[PDB]
Design a protein around this motif. Structure first.
Motif, PDB file in Angstrom:
ATOM      1  N   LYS A 564       0.819  -1.208   0.000  1.00 31.96           N
ATOM      2  CA  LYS A 564       0.000   0.000   0.000  1.00 31.96           C
ATOM      3  C   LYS A 564       0.855   1.261   0.000  1.00 31.96           C
ATOM      4  O   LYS A 564       0.532   2.236  -0.686  1.00 31.96           O
TER       5      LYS A 564
ATOM      6  N   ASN D 144      -6.722  -6.781  -9.692  1.00 28.32           N
ATOM      7  CA  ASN D 144      -5.837  -6.511  -8.565  1.00 28.32           C
ATOM      8  C   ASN D 144      -5.105  -7.771  -8.129  1.00 28.32           C
ATOM      9  O   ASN D 144      -3.903  -7.730  -7.849  1.00 28.32           O
ATOM     10  N   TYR D 148      -1.023  -8.193  -7.685  1.00 25.73           N
ATOM     11  CA  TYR D 148      -0.365  -8.623  -6.456  1.00 25.73           C
ATOM     12  C   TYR D 148       0.415  -9.905  -6.680  1.00 25.73           C
ATOM     13  O   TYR D 148       1.552 -10.039  -6.223  1.00 25.73           O
TER      14      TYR D 148
HETATM   15  C1  LIG Z   1       7.980  -7.535  -0.231  1.00 23.52           C
HETATM   16  C2  LIG Z   1       8.052  -8.247  -1.611  1.00 23.52           C
HETATM   17  C3  LIG Z   1       6.747  -8.035  -2.403  1.00 23.52           C
HETATM   18  C4  LIG Z   1       6.343  -6.537  -2.431  1.00 23.52           C
HETATM   19  C5  LIG Z   1       5.300  -6.323  -3.568  1.00 23.52           C
HETATM   20  C6  LIG Z   1       4.760  -4.905  -3.473  1.00 23.52           C
HETATM   21  C7  LIG Z   1       4.632  -4.276  -4.884  1.00 23.52           C
HETATM   22  C8  LIG Z   1       3.205  -3.698  -5.097  1.00 23.52           C
HETATM   23  C9  LIG Z   1       2.187  -4.857  -5.203  1.00 23.52           C
HETATM   24  C10 LIG Z   1       0.755  -4.313  -5.601  1.00 23.52           C
HETATM   25  C11 LIG Z   1       0.801  -3.516  -6.903  1.00 23.52           C
HETATM   26  C12 LIG Z   1      -0.667  -3.131  -7.304  1.00 23.52           C
HETATM   27  O1  LIG Z   1      -0.671  -1.775  -7.834  1.00 23.52           O
HETATM   28  C13 LIG Z   1      -1.655  -0.941  -7.333  1.00 23.52           C
HETATM   29  O2  LIG Z   1      -1.738  -1.115  -5.849  1.00 23.52           O
HETATM   30  C14 LIG Z   1      -2.891  -0.408  -5.239  1.00 23.52           C
HETATM   31  C15 LIG Z   1      -2.954  -0.778  -3.787  1.00 23.52           C
HETATM   32  O3  LIG Z   1      -1.707  -1.226  -3.364  1.00 23.52           O
HETATM   33  C16 LIG Z   1      -4.188  -0.770  -5.943  1.00 23.52           C
HETATM   34  O4  LIG Z   1      -5.308   0.020  -5.407  1.00 23.52           O
HETATM   35  C17 LIG Z   1      -6.085  -0.656  -4.494  1.00 23.52           C
HETATM   36  O5  LIG Z   1      -5.641  -0.268  -3.115  1.00 23.52           O
HETATM   37  C18 LIG Z   1      -5.697   1.213  -2.976  1.00 23.52           C
HETATM   38  C19 LIG Z   1      -5.276   1.603  -1.616  1.00 23.52           C
HETATM   39  O6  LIG Z   1      -6.141   1.063  -0.650  1.00 23.52           O
HETATM   40  C20 LIG Z   1      -7.107   1.741  -3.260  1.00 23.52           C
HETATM   41  O7  LIG Z   1      -7.069   3.168  -3.275  1.00 23.52           O
HETATM   42  C21 LIG Z   1      -7.649   1.257  -4.576  1.00 23.52           C
HETATM   43  O8  LIG Z   1      -9.039   1.615  -4.677  1.00 23.52           O
HETATM   44  C22 LIG Z   1      -7.514  -0.230  -4.735  1.00 23.52           C
HETATM   45  O9  LIG Z   1      -7.882  -0.600  -6.063  1.00 23.52           O
HETATM   46  C23 LIG Z   1      -4.081  -0.449  -7.393  1.00 23.52           C
HETATM   47  O10 LIG Z   1      -5.349  -0.747  -8.047  1.00 23.52           O
HETATM   48  C24 LIG Z   1      -2.975  -1.228  -8.025  1.00 23.52           C
HETATM   49  O11 LIG Z   1      -2.883  -0.858  -9.418  1.00 23.52           O
END
Ligand SMILES: CCCCCCCCCCCCO[C@@H]1O[C@H](CO)[C@@H](O[C@H]2O[C@H](CO)[C@@H](O)[C@H](O)[C@H]2O)[C@H](O)[C@H]1O
Ligand SMILES: CCCCCCCCCCCCCCCCCC(=O)OC[C@H](COP(=O)([O-])OCC(O)COP(=O)([O-])OC[C@@H](COC(=O)CCCCCCCCCCCCCCCCC)OC(=O)CCCCCCCCCCCCCCCCC)OC(=O)CCCCCCCCCCCCCCCCC
Ligand SMILES: CCCCCCCCCCCCCCCCCC(=O)OC[C@H](COP(=O)(O)OCCN)OC(=O)CCCCCCCCCCCCCCCCC
Ligand SMILES: CCCCCCCCCCCCCCCCCC(=O)OC[C@H](COP(=O)(O)OCCN)OC(=O)CCCCCCCCCCCCCCCCC
Ligand SMILES: CCCCCCCCCCCCO[C@@H]1O[C@H](CO)[C@@H](O[C@H]2O[C@H](CO)[C@@H](O)[C@H](O)[C@H]2O)[C@H](O)[C@H]1O
Ligand SMILES: CCCCCCCCCCCCO[C@@H]1O[C@H](CO)[C@@H](O[C@H]2O[C@H](CO)[C@@H](O)[C@H](O)[C@H]2O)[C@H](O)[C@H]1O
Lengths: 606, 103, 171, 459, 126, 170
Positions: A564, D144, D148
């Motif tokens: 997040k 989503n 992830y």
């Molecule tokens: C530690 C090793 C692994 C680490 C991996 C971390 C990298 C990021 C992984 C997730 C990537 C997703 O990318 C983006 O993330 C946010 C939330 O995070 C998503 O958004 C989602 O959560 C956000 C926050 O609550 C909301 O405002 C939104 O309505 C919801 O759709 C996006 O729709 C997505 O496009």
């Protein structure tokens, strides 16, 4: 040897055949219950042959017939121990199960899934025999968990009822808590002795046996419903009456005691373990007998009777008399199974009424069930020369004359008096006085399946103890010299219990109205243990699950600290990079700043 | 505090229907229309043959010719020997105990 | 939702059942049942409703102190030993619609009569809906009560799941 | 391995050249034949592995995983063909093609001799898996869940790529047979701490380790049934299989580097097991059950003992069949009521008697009833962690209690009690559904008769 | 002896002093509660009794419950002194606690083995 | 059927029947019935099967592994020599597991056979079990899941260095 080993295995294989026939090979669904009942009766005959051979010459053997698996230096084989404890228990279990199955053919006649019911009873019996004949801990564990799972399916037989599902899961919960001890012993025995086989454990005979034996004590606590893990057994009355009869006599509950008996070569050298089991058994036998004093459900009184009698077996383990504990298992199986069968006879005649306050006046209406109920109560209370006397009285003398915890000894004697009181309570309220049941009289105990099944257990409840005690070979030096007041203590306290019970029972007829005491409420509500523990502990665990584990951690902070927050930083960074005004002037101005910085700050021109 | 006349009327109408429904659960005579001591010993004779004799033949064959042909698969506790016993294998005679002091 | 009268009569029935649980013996229960009935009779004609409420409140406190911790329960009442016992045998009638044709063929008479009930349900449904519409105030119903049928040939609205419910002893 | 790679490839022309109405029949039949031939990989020796060529080898670890992988493909086709019935023909064939290509990558992944080859195929499985979830998942949140899933993997796997290339520069080879002989001890230093983390984190994220598991409940709630089956059965085991191999070259640093991950797993399994008691979505509950079971595997791999490695292998196979069964059971309810809410449809044993038996058998394996291979694997891990530290038995024992509670809770809630009155479309179980359930449980229970073949190289 | 309520043992309704002191304002509220319940009952029964319906009567209350118990949490989550301290206390704390329990146990065991005071006489399985 | 030296057994001593009762022994008659009803028919079937086997006699062999240089004679990183030394070590390791199993089997059979006199009469078996377990533990214990001849040799040298150090200071 060839006949002994061949016939001992044929007993076990005989019991599995009705299960194999469920593959619709050569099945006669018309009377599957009769087929299953016939298999049990024939298995009882075949098991008496090796039992007779053991009694004659003491023939014992081990059958390691199938090599299952070798894990480096640990070789696991399907191995069967055909010894003293398995030779005498199997015929008793089969004889009792024969009566219970015949009785169930009457009691469960109108159950649409009677065929499945008899299959589950047979599977129950098979997993117990695996437990009793196991020669290694992994095989024993198969039977250990098998009876637990069969208890779950039979306690929750009427699965549309929430209380039945709750009781069934409660048995699983408590028994799995005991199973923590079982795996502890397995881990200790592998790590320290390199074995799960009884032979190697007994040969190596560790002196530092506290940890494995505490684990076994914990396993027995759960399985035999000793204090601390006890409430599940009275709750198991949710099941059909034949389940309770089998659960409380020939199978599930005595397994914990049997586990400790099998390891007596270790416990007999461990006084610390003896003290723990002695005191655990004493509080159990006293506390559950006290609970039985005020119960009104007939099945619950007899359920608390089992817990009290199991605690006495655990006391016998505590005073280092494993063979006396084993004898009580065998004698108790007869009259305890009869008592449940007699109660089922009453419940059936009164259209599923189980409250003794709605019974009464049945002494002449149900003469045969009355006779069996009186005989069973007299065997339970140790009336001389009935089946229960040949174990309990020897246990009381052994405890009276032993070097033992004085408090545990007193608690055991008082519990013996309480046994007389709660047995009197059943007889007084169920059979004597005037009828208190509804007006349309449907009393009828004239079914041959009911009569014959109870009849056989009545004969056992009279003579089985005498026959067994006169045939088993001595393995101890029984204590037979003692003062007159230590020799007759069991008989006296029992008689005083009967007399005192009659005073209490007759006082309920006086036209006087009495307010309840704290002792009465404490007894009726089972010491508040289920009320406090079954509300508090589930609340605390279930609250932790959703509030903290699921929401606080897995849906919030583990989300926050990574995916997040990382997404926010990139989104903010992207808006910095791209929010440009499209002006030639500003871009070339940044070029100048870049060229200057490249030299003055970083000396890229060098 | 009894039924209102409308409550009474509704219960009467549902009662008529419920009793008609329950009557219609009765099976007609032909339903279900299905698609196409000497005895006592024989019943118990066939059972003993198929559930005791046949299994014991299989177990004995298996024990005799497969299990007992491997080391330590069946291990007996060795028979107890008492003073005054004779051994079959050797013919050895075990001597008696001393004379007991009178008691 | 309970009037004062309903509260008093519920306590009387409840107090007698706990009294019966204490007494056990019928002659003893009869004796104290009359004594308890006398106590309710002395304040039968109380008019000062403030006093009547105080009498009810004090009586409830008395009941709580003197209740049986393990009162008798009819076997099939909630909390009884047979409560919900036969729910596993209750099967809804719609399950017969999924029977294989060969299964239905074993009961030709039962399923012919079943089709008559389904026809009756189908032809009655529109009128049942209309009756409820025209008898329901604007803001929807204010109570759970349902009306009878008014004309001849009509069925009481929403009758199917009451009339065709599983039998109490369905097997 | 070409005898398995080529017929797997040939499944794609078979599916595309089949008659329109015979795509499921043909692909299912021939992938069962491939599964049959995979039993030839059981030619395993006591000392040496089965070394086919310069590219591919099989040993007692990869062989059971290979057989599970090839068995799952026909089961996945059986499970998918119903909810895909309305889909047009070309998109049906594209779905089957993604499943076939997933199997091809998996069988190469588990037999790759060189670690960088293992990496590429290990990464390639993401593409079809992501396509299956995002394209054929049902709900809005599949997009989503796809992200992830994709970025959790790559966040860990990219550092692994750098570490692997670094090892090859230093050692000269990444061939796993070579590393068995040229392995040198890993000395203490901050450089080696991060080399260790780079070598392990990618596999931890896939297992998944507690704390890096939040992508998995998402993926399952959004995936179609076949996606869930392959995810739970095989794709999680890519992490375990990877860890079992790479730990060879991380000694003795693993002695102390494993501590934080043992704590996360030991405490993680109790947390996730407790979480299962409160889950409201049936797929989510099964997903959290996987995290708890795989926490045992992480501990077993990290403490590196013969008993723990044998238990880890058995657990991976046993969980693969059990969790795949549970998803298939939950899906068969979904295809009737179209909701994953556990409390929606109750008392189903009254309406679907035989399906309730499959529910009982699956639950019993999930709680590891002896002598199932589920219990054998769990027990072997419990035995080995006891020697590692006697106190672990308390945590192991508590998890066993909680596991029984949530497994039977799931059985009780959905199958027992009273049926829901208004749910009147619970049609009788299809032959396809019953066969699908039995094709999980029957091999699972048969393995109890010869457990050695799923115990791995340390046997 | 007055009744003392607890979290796991509610006050009996007959001992509730608010049960008897009922005003016209309280009867008005009870009537409005029964109107909502009756309105929902009618809406349900019209679908439940419809002979042509086959399927599930979707319940928005059930959907709202499952949605609230998952997807709706993080949007309404605020990092503050409460959730951070609970987040730390039950998130990192147990891992540190168990780390020291096991680390201390293993250091003690390893020191005894090296000195030859741990009995491993028959320990050849691990 | 098996080598009696590998799996030894004492000479069995059975007492002769010595009845002190006029009642017949039911076991004696059941033994006769069992011999007549069970054993004889079983023996006849087996003898038929053994006759068929005698018509198709064929053989199988116990594989012999020639000794090759061990890991001590392998140059560092010489995989070809290391491989042959490693495979041999793995075969010996599997053999040593079964030698411990044979001794454990002897110990377990003695315990059952000697009954209540087992604590005294099984001393020789217990002593042999103790020694082989010690020898096995020295060789293989603590090597870990990724064990090898290299790690086994390193453990042995650590033990040798400790033994030399103690001997010097003495
Ligand atoms: C530690 C090793 C692994 C680490 C991996 C971390 C990298 C990021 C992984 C997730 C990537 C997703 O990318 C983006 O993330 C946010 C939330 O995070 C998503 O958004 C989602 O959560 C956000 C926050 O609550 C909301 O405002 C939104 O309505 C919801 O759709 C996006 O729709 C997505 O496009
Ligand atoms: C060569 C290759 C071989 C291929 C495999 C061959 C085996 C498969 C057999 C296929 C044929 C099955 C069949 O036709 O029987 C129909 C058989 C009987 O017909 P039915 O009465 O109409 O069944 C309806 C209900 O489903 C019936 O439900 P139910 O509740 O009445 O009984 C179902 C039963 C499930 O059936 C069983 O598992 C039998 C009990 C275990 C033994 O469930 C249980 O009872 C659970 C008990 C588990 C605890 C038992 C204690 C554990 C001890 C473990 C012992 C280990 C050895 C030592 O039905 C089934 O059992 C269906 C499941 C069949 C597969 C079960 C797994 C068997 C392996
Ligand atoms: C602690 C262990 C717990 C075990 C958990 C797992 C439980 C699984 C279910 C238990 C099944 C009980 C029956 C066990 C015997 C079945 C297997 C069998 O009998 O054949 C195997 C046996 C091979 O001999 P063995 O050396 O013991 O096996 C080593 C390889 N495993 O074969 C033989 O030796 C003889 C085979 C020939 C039989 C001839 C008799 C034929 C009779 C006619 C057919 C009927
Ligand atoms: C996001 C933005 C941050 C980007 C990452 C920041 C870089 C982190 C670098 C960690 C330190 C690794 C390193 O630089 O080691 C260099 C050193 C090379 O020196 P050399 O001569 O080859 O060998 C002797 C050792 N001095 O020794 C080495 O080469 C050993 C290192 C092997 C390769 C390391 C691979 C990357 C390690 C960082 C990631 C590890 C954590 C992964 C977490 C993922 C979680 C999902
Ligand atoms: C370990 C290293 C791993 C490196 C992995 C890098 C992954 C980068 C993923 C893309 C980052 C940007 O992704 C973007 O992030 C923002 C913020 O979360 C999301 O924005 C969403 O969440 C925010 C947070 O409440 C809301 O205010 C916003 O309305 C909503 O749209 C976008 O929907 C998403 O598209
Ligand atoms: C020299 C380089 C070129 C090498 C080319 C080698 C292969 C040449 C194949 C030529 C024939 C292709 O055949 C052409 O495609 C497919 C498969 O047959 C057929 O159409 C297909 O429709 C569906 C599948 O979509 C199926 O019913 C069936 O597979 C077939 O009828 C066309 O009706 C046919 O015209």
């Amino acid at each position: 040897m060839n006949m002994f080993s061949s016939l001992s295995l044929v007993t076990l294989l005989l019991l599995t055949m009705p299960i194999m026939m469920m593959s619709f090979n050569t099945y006669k669904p018309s009377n599957y219950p009769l087929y299953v009942k016939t298999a049990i009766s024939y298995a009882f005959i075949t098991s008496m042959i090796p039992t007779m051979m053991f009694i004659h010459s003491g023939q014992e053997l081990i059958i390691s017939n199938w090599h299952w698996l070798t894990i480096q230096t640990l070789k696991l084989s399907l191995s069967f121990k055909m010894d003293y404890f398995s030779m005498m228990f199997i015929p008793v279990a089969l004889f009792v199960t024969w009566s219970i199955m015949e009785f169930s053919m009457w009691y469960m006649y109108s159950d649409p899934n009677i065929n499945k019911f008899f299959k589950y009873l047979l599977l129950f019996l098979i997993t117990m025999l695996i437990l009793v004949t196991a020669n290694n801990l992994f095989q024993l564990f198969i039977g250990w968990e098998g009876v637990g799972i069969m208890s779950f399916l039979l306690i929750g037989w009427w699965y549309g009822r929430a209380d039945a599902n709750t009781a069934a899961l409660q048995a699983i919960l408590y028994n799995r808590i005991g199973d923590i001890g079982f795996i502890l012993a397995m881990a200790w025995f592998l790590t320290n002795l390199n074995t799960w086989d009884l032979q190697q454990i007994f040969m190596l005979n560790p002196s530092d046996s506290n940890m494995p034996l505490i684990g076994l004590a914990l396993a027995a606590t759960g399985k035999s419903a000793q204090f601390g893990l006890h409430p599940w057994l009275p709750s198991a009355m949710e099941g059909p009456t034949p389940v309770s009869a089998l659960l409380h006599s020939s199978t599930m509950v005595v397994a914990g005691i049997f586990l400790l008996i099998r390891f007596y070569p270790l416990t007999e050298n461990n006084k610390y373990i003896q003290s723990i089991t002695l005191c655990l058994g004493a509080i159990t036998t006293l506390f559950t007998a006290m609970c039985a004093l005020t119960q009104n459900d007939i099945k619950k009184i007899i359920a608390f009777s089992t817990s009290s009698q199991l605690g006495l077996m655990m006391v016998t383990i505590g005073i280092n008399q494993p063979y006396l504990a084993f004898l009580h298992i065998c004698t108790h199986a007869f009259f305890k199974a009869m008592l449940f069968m007699c109660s089922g006879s009453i419940i059936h005649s009164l259209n599923d009424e189980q409250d003794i306050r709605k019974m009464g006046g049945l002494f002449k209406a149900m003469p045969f069930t009355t006779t069996a109920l009186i005989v069973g109560s007299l065997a339970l209370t140790g009336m001389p020369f009935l089946t229960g006397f040949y174990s309990k009285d020897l246990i009381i003398e052994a405890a009276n004359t032993s070097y033992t915890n004085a408090w545990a000894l007193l608690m055991t004697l008082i519990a013996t008096s309480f046994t007389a009181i709660y047995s009197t309570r059943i007889i007084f309220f169920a059979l004597l006085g005037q009828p208190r049941f509804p007006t349309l009289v449907n009393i009828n105990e004239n079914n041959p399946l009911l009569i014959n099944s109870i009849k056989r257990l009545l004969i056992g409840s009279l003579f089985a103890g005498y026959i067994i005690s006169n045939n088993i070979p001595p393995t101890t030096i029984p204590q037979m010299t003692m003062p007159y007041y230590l020799k007759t203590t069991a008989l006296i306290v029992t008689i005083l219990g009967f007399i005192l019970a009659l005073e209490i029972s007759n006082m309920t007829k006086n036209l006087k109205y009495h307010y309840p005491s704290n002792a009465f409420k404490f007894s009726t509500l089972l010491g508040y243990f289920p009320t406090i523990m079954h509300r508090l502990a589930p609340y605390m665990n279930l609250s932790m699950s959703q509030k903290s584990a699921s929401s606080l951690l897995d849906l919030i902070w583990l989300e926050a600290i990574l995916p997040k927050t990382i997404s926010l930083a990139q989104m903010k960074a992207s808006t910095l990079v791209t929010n440009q005004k499209g002006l030639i002037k500003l871009y070339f101005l940044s070029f100048l700043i870049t060229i200057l910085i490249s030299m003055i700050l970083f000396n890229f021109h060098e | 505090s009894g039924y209102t006349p409308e409550e009474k009327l509704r219960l009467q109408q549902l009662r008529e229907l419920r009793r008609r429904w329950l009557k219609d659960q009765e099976l007609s005579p032909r339903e279900p229309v299905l698609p196409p001591v000497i005895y006592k010993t024989y019943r118990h004779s066939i059972f003993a043959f198929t559930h005791v004799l046949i299994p014991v033949w299989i177990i004995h064959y298996y024990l005799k010719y497969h299990v007992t042909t491997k080391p330590y698969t069946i291990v007996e506790k060795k028979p107890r020997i008492f003073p005054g016993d004779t051994i079959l294998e050797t013919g050895e005679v075990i001597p008696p105990m001393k004379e007991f002091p009178d008691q | 939702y309970l009037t004062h009268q309903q509260k008093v009569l519920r306590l009387y029935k409840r107090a007698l059942r706990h009294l019966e649980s204490w007494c056990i013996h019928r002659d003893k229960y009869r004796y104290f049942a009359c004594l308890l009935r006398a106590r309710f009779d002395e304040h039968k004609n109380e008019k000062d409703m403030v006093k009547a409420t105080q009498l009810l409140r004090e009586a409830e406190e008395e009941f709580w102190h003197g209740q049986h911790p393990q009162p008798y329960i009819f076997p099939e009442s909630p909390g009884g030993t047979s409560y919900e016992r036969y729910e596993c045998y209750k099967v809804p009638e719609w399950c017969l619609d999924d029977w294989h044709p060969s299964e239905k063929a074993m009961y030709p008479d039962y399923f012919a009569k079943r089709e008559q009930w389904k026809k009756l349900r189908r032809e009655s449904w529109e009128r049942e809906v209309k009756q409820l519409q025209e008898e329901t105030p604007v803001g929807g119903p204010r109570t759970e009560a349902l009306p009878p049928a008014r004309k001849q040939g009509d069925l009481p609205p929403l009758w199917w799941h009451i009339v065709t419910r599983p039998r109490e002893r369905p097997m | 391995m070409l005898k398995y790679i080529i017929p797997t490839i040939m499944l794609m022309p078979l599916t595309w050249l089949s008659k329109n109405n015979m795509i499921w029949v043909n692909s299912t039949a021939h992938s069962l034949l491939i599964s049959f031939t995979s039993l030839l990989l059981m030619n395993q020796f006591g000392d040496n592995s089965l070394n086919f060529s310069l590219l591919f080898f099989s040993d007692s670890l990869s062989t059971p995983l290979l057989i599970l992988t090839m068995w799952l493909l026909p089961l996945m086709l059986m499970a998918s063909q119903h909810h895909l019935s309305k889909e047009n023909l070309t998109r049906k064939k594209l779905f089957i093609t993604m499943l076939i290509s997933l199997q091809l990558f998996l069988i190469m992944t588990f037999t790759a001799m060189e670690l960088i080859l293992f990496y590429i195929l290990f990464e390639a499985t993401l593409v079809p898996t992501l396509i299956i979830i995002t394209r054929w998942g049902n709900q809005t949140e599949r997009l989503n869940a796809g992200l992830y899933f994709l970025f959790y993997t790559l966040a860990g796997s990219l550092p692994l790529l750098v570490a692997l290339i670094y090892i090859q520069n230093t050692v000269g080879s990444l061939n796993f047979l070579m590393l068995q002989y040229w392995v040198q001890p890993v000395h203490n230093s901050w450089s080696n701490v991060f080399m260790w983390l780079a070598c392990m984190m990618a596999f931890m994220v896939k297992m998944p380790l507690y704390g890096l598991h939040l992508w998995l409940p998402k993926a399952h709630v959004e995936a179609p049934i076949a996606g869930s089956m392959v995810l739970a059965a095989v794709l999680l085991k890519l992490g375990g299989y990877g860890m079992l191999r790479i730990t060879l070259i991380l000694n003795p640093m693993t002695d102390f580097m494993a501590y934080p991950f043992i704590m996360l797993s030991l405490w993680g399994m109790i947390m996730t097991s407790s979480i299962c008691l409160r889950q409201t979505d049936l797929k989510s509950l099964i997903a959290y059950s996987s995290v708890s079971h795989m926490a045992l595997v992480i501990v077993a791999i990290l403490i590196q003992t013969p008993w723990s490695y044998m238990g880890a292998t058995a657990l991976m196979i046993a969980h693969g069949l059990t969790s795949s069964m549970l998803f298939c059971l939950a899906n068969s309810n979904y295809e009737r009521i179209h909701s994953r809410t556990m409390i929606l449809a109750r008392g189903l044993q009254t309406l679907l008697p035989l399906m309730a038996t499959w529910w009982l058998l699956a639950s019993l394996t999930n709680l590891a009833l002896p002598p199932t291979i589920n219990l054998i694997g769990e027990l072997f891990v419990v035995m080995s962690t006891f020697s590692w530290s006697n106190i672990t038995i308390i945590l192991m024992g508590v998890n066993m209690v909680i596991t029984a509670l949530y497994s039977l809770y799931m059985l009780i809630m959905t199958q027992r009690g009273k049926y829901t009155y208004h749910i009147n479309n619970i049609s009788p179980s299809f032959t396809r559904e019953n066969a699908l359930m039995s094709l999980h449980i029957l091999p699972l229970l048969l393995l109890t008769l010869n457990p050695k073949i799923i115990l791995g190289p340390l046997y | 002896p007055k009744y003392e309520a607890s979290r796991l043992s509610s006050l009996p309704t007959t001992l509730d002093p608010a049960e008897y002191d009922i005003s016209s304002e309280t009867r008005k509220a009870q009537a409005e509660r029964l109107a909502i319940r009756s309105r929902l009952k009618r809406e349900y029964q019209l679908q439940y009794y419809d002979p042509s319906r086959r399927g599930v009567i979707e319940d928005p209350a059930l959907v709202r419950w499952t949605y609230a118990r998952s997807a709706n949490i993080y949007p309404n989550f605020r990092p503050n002194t409460k959730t951070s301290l609970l987040g730390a206390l039950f998130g990192i704390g147990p891992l540190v606690f168990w780390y020291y329990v096991f680390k201390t146990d293993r250091d003690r065991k390893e020191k005894l083995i090296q000195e030859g005071k741990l009995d491993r006489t028959f320990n050849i399985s691990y | 059927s098996w080598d009696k030296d590998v799996y030894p057994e004492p000479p069995r001593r059975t007492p002769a029947p010595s009845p002190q009762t006029s009642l017949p022994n039911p076991i004696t008659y059941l033994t006769k019935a069992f011999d007549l009803l069970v054993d004889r028919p079983v023996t006849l079937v087996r003898e038929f099967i053994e006759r068929q086997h005698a018509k198709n006699k064929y053989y199988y062999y116990h594989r012999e592994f020639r000794r090759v240089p061990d890991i001590t004679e392998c140059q560092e990183k010489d995989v070809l020599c290391m491989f042959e030394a490693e495979m041999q070590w793995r075969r010996d390791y599997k053999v040593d597991q079964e030698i411990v199993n044979i001794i454990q089997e002897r110990l377990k059979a003695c315990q059952q056979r000697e009954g209540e006199s087992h604590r005294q009469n099984c001393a020789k078996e217990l002593e042999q079990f103790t020694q082989v377990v010690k020898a096995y533990q020295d060789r293989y214990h603590d090597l870990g899941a990724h064990y090898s001849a290299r790690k086994c040799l390193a453990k042995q040298k650590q033990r040798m260095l400790a033994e030399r150090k103690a001997a010097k200071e003495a």
